[PDB]
């Protein structure tokens, strides 16, 4: 009957739901302060509260929308779908949870939007020349990955300001390379040239039309260019139903956030688009560089993968930046850039080998635990991702959505999406902690029989100044009567020490360092045994001084674990199969075995007196292992009969025993037959 909420939720209909998923509470005077309250649904149900007055909400896992996952990227009309659930309805109760799953496929033939963002520093003039054959060739090789690929183009040459640019010391650097019998272009920060197009032959021509500029400061403006290419969807030509590949091609180290201080650039980068009608970054002289933080958030939020097509001698910085820009990839570029075709095809294949989920707008009170199915039906806990996938393969994530306490009565949208994917799961989450009869309540002073109080969930509830079992003994004074069962067995305390009986219920006057709950002031939130300066070492919660252990802990002080890896032996058996596990350690078995797993046993009757027991049952149907029906699993040794126990010359133990039939049987116990235990039992005892 009396279980948890018996003492913890009786004072409040919201509290009983706050306290435990098993509790219910009747209304409409079904059990008009009969005796038990809250308890378990089933106890009230049996004690005349079977009708739906019980106010017993349950948690639920429902799917609002499940458009089926698609096999092919070109399969337009119905939107090509990359994940299975689309919209999910989640209903929680306090300290409860529900499971769901996320199926994600690396859909085959999925369209590709690729932008070629080029380093336009003078060392690249021969690259622009080599690249004259790309676009056409890049797309051609990519036709195998997908039938639909678009190619765009842009460039960067660093911020056109005093310390980066040759400062325009003279006029001569307004249109540079006058220094070396040639001509080249001025510095522009970031430029956009070609939006993404299916007419990829346009790239061949657009790159031939370009030429390089001069940079004094070796570090590149590549981070502004990446961020703008990443952010400016409207010009870059990113279509949401496509993978976005930003290819960054360069021969040099990048310039980063707050380095811009040298040019008087101190304005924070807000991660916004600043490219105007001239397809030019107008912020190139006023805004600083984006941080690794900003790049990561914007490319993740908008599903842009970055490919670093970087020459060999600077790879160390790009690889290290990618570690701090998750989801990106870095390859090695040839000095003539002829391998961009291959670099990109492999970079794409690498990008599509990882499935990773991110949850947007997740509230502080909810915890989403993941177990990721990386292979077959095996799941690894603590993972938002799986590695080693091919295009056309799937990944399956198991998610547990748990809520702590009782968060506010608002509907929140948890967006669970693979990174780089447009499709996402919207989980719509609400919290059922109220009783319907909590809202359907009209306190109104009167109605609590003859009195002044409140009313909820089918019963009256007089507050301070009126209290009583129903409506009486405001501050005692009608109290020196009625007695009542204020304590078990009528042992006559006023109320279990910390409290006093008040007209059928006790009132706890204590208000120091915690709370007291229950009819007889039974539950002390603050009073239990410390293990090392803390109640039960922080490995459980207390209720009435009784500590309720957490997962994988036991004992009064919750310091005895139920974890067994520390008492497990090298053979996979707890206590090596000969001993008892206790508090993460091992209790010695009678023959005299010793050590953490009973590894050593110098006294132990030789194995022959333990192995005969197996032979005696597996072959002769006698012994403890026969009577206990245990030999078949206990003895995993191979036992063979032989006509003769031969001079093997190897590690064979000569064992012997006299049986129930007054016969003497000899056998040999041989160790390490390619890791197996082999017994040779004479056919003729």
């Amino acid at each position: 009957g009396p279980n948890i909420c018996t003492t913890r939720g009786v004072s409040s209909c919201q509290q009983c739901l706050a306290v435990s998923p098993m509790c219910a509470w009747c209304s409409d005077e079904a059990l008009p302060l009969g005796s038990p309250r809250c308890d378990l649904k089933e106890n009230l149900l049996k004690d005349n509260c079977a009708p739906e007055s019980i106010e017993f909400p349950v948690s639920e896992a429902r799917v609002l929308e499940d458009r089926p996952l698609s096999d092919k990227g070109s399969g337009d009309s119905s939107q090509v779908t990359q994940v299975s659930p689309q919209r999910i309805a989640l209903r929680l109760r306090p300290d409860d949870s529900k499971n769901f799953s996320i199926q994600v496929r690396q859909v085959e033939d999925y369209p590709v939007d690729i932008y070629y963002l080029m380093d336009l520093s003078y060392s690249m003039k021969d690259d622009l020349w080599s690249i004259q054959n790309l676009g056409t060739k890049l797309a051609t090789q990519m036709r195998k990955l997908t039938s639909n690929l678009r190619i765009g183009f842009g460039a960067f040459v660093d911020k056109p300001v005093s310390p980066y640019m040759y400062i325009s010391p003279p006029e001569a650097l307004e249109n540079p390379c006058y220094d070396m019998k040639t001509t080249c272009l001025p510095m522009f920060g970031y430029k956009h040239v070609l939006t993404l197009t299916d007419q990829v032959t346009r790239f061949n021509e657009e790159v031939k039309k370009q030429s390089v500029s001069r940079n004094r400061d070796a570090p590149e403006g590549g981070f502004d260019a990446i961020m703008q290419a990443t952010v400016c969807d409207e010009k870059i030509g990113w279509r949401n139903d496509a993978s976005h590949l930003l290819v960054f091609t360069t021969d040099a180290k990048t310039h980063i956030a707050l380095d811009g201080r040298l040019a008087g650039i101190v304005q924070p980068n807000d991660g916004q688009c600043h490219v105007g009608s001239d397809n030019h970054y107008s912020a190139s002289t006023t805004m600083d560089y984006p941080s690794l933080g900003l790049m990561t958030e914007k490319l993740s939020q908008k599903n842009i993968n970055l490919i670093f097509a970087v020459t060999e001698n600077v790879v160390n910085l790009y690889q290290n930046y990618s570690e701090l820009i998750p989801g990106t990839t870095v390859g090695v570029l040839s000095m003539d850039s002829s391998n961009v075709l291959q670099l990109i095809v492999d970079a794409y294949g690498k990008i599509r080998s990882k499935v990773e989920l991110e949850v947007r707008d997740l509230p502080e009170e909810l915890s989403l635990s993941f177990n990721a199915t990386c292979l077959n039906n095996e799941v690894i806990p603590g993972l938002k991702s799986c590695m080693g996938l091919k295009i056309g393969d799937t990944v399956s994530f198991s998610i547990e959505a748990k809520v702590r306490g009782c968060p506010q009565e608002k509907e929140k949208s948890f967006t669970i999406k693979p990174v780089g994917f447009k499709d996402s799961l919207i989980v719509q989450v609400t919290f059922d902690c109220d009783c319907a009869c909590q809202a359907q309540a009209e306190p109104n002073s009167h109605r609590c029989n003859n009195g002044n109080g409140t009313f909820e969930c089918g019963v009256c509830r007089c507050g301070p100044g009126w209290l009583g079992s129903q409506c009486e003994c405001s501050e005692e004074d009608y109290r020196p009567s009625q007695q009542d069962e204020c304590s078990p067995r009528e042992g006559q305390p006023v109320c279990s020490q910390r409290g006093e009986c008040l007209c059928g219920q006790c009132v706890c006057h204590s208000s120091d360092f915690g709370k007291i709950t229950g009819k007889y002031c039974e539950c002390d939130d603050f009073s239990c045994v410390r293990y090392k300066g803390e109640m039960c070492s922080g490995h459980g919660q207390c209720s009435c001084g009784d500590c309720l252990c957490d997962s994988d802990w036991t004992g009064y002080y919750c310091n005895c674990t139920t974890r067994t890896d520390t008492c497990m032996s090298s053979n996979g058996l707890l206590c090596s199969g000969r001993g008892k596990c206790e508090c993460g350690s091992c209790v010695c078995i009678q023959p005299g075995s010793y050590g953490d797993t009973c590894e050593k046993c110098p006294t132990c009757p030789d194995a022959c007196t333990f192995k005969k027991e197996c032979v005696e049952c597996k072959k002769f149907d006698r012994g403890a292992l026969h009577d206990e029906n245990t030999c078949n699993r206990y003895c995993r040794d191979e036992i063979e009969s032989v006509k003769e126990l031969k001079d093997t010359g190897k590690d064979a133990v000569n064992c012997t025993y006299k049986n129930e039939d007054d016969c003497v049987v000899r056998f040999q116990y041989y160790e390490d037959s390619s890791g197996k235990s082999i017994l040779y039992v004479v056919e003729e005892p």
């Epitope: 325009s168 010391p169 003279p170 001569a172 307004e174 249109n175 070396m180 019998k181 040639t182």
Partner: antibody, heavy 117, light 107 residues
């Protein structure tokens, strides 16, 4: 103080050749670009050729290219212009000049070249 | 590239002010210089890079302009200002000079 002195001008028969020199002192000769600019009888100035500070890059007027060579000896602090296949159009006062980022900041006194039969 | 320079000749009474104008067929940013040439003497840089004067050149000489149109103004012309003036472009190969202006002093 910058000192520039050109020499070697004179009368050359058409189709001929002639080498002009320009000595320099008072400055770090190898730290600056050098140019030859000529003043045609109409008093028009025309840039002829440029040699970079280290001598690596050499630029010529299109109607001069393939006939003239500009060179320098940074140890001898002397600039040269070796002309060949000379025409009447090449008659002019030749001036060597020191650069300041595209400008000709300092000029010589001039050496007169006459191309005539 | 063609550098057009006007006026070709100029007669200025001492104390009066004048200006010369340089026109480039394309944009030459600020890559335009001005020179002065007196009789039996070589050209001298007056103004470099459209408006930057030099070191011992009077403030009376002030250059201005960008791209395609540049000026050289001379406030209160002195007797010693007589002589030829030239603009020169350093943007694109070959470098080019304007036709030149002959400044004469009225007396």
């Amino acid at each position: 103080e910058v000192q520039l002195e050109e020499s070697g001008g004179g009368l050359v028969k058409p189709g001929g050749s002639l080498k002009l020199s320009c000595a320099a002192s008072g400055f770090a000769f190898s730290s600056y670009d050098m140019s030859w600019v000529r003043q045609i009888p109409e008093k028009r100035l025309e840039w002829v050729a440029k040699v970079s500070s280290g001598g690596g890059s050499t630029y010529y007027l299109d109607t001069v290219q393939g006939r003239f060579t500009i060179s320098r000896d940074n140890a001898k602090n002397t600039l040269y212009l070796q002309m060949s296949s000379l025409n009447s159009e090449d008659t002019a006062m030749y001036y060597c000049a020191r650069h300041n980022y595209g400008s000709f900041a300092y000029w010589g006194q001039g050496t007169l070249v006459t191309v005539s039969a | 590239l063609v550098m057009t320079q006007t006026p070709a000749t100029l007669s200025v009474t001492p104390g009066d002010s004048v200006s010369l104008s340089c026109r480039a067929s394309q944009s030459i940013s600020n890559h335009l210089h001005w020179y002065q040439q007196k009789s039996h003497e070589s050209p001298r840089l007056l103004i470099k890079y459209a408006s930057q004067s030099i070191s011992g050149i009077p403030s009376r000489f002030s250059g201005s302009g960008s791209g395609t149109d540049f000026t050289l103004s001379i406030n209160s012309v002195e007797t010693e200002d007589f002589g030829m003036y030239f603009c020169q472009q350093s943007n694109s190969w070959p470098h080019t000079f304007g036709g030149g202006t002959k400044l004469e002093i009225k007396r």
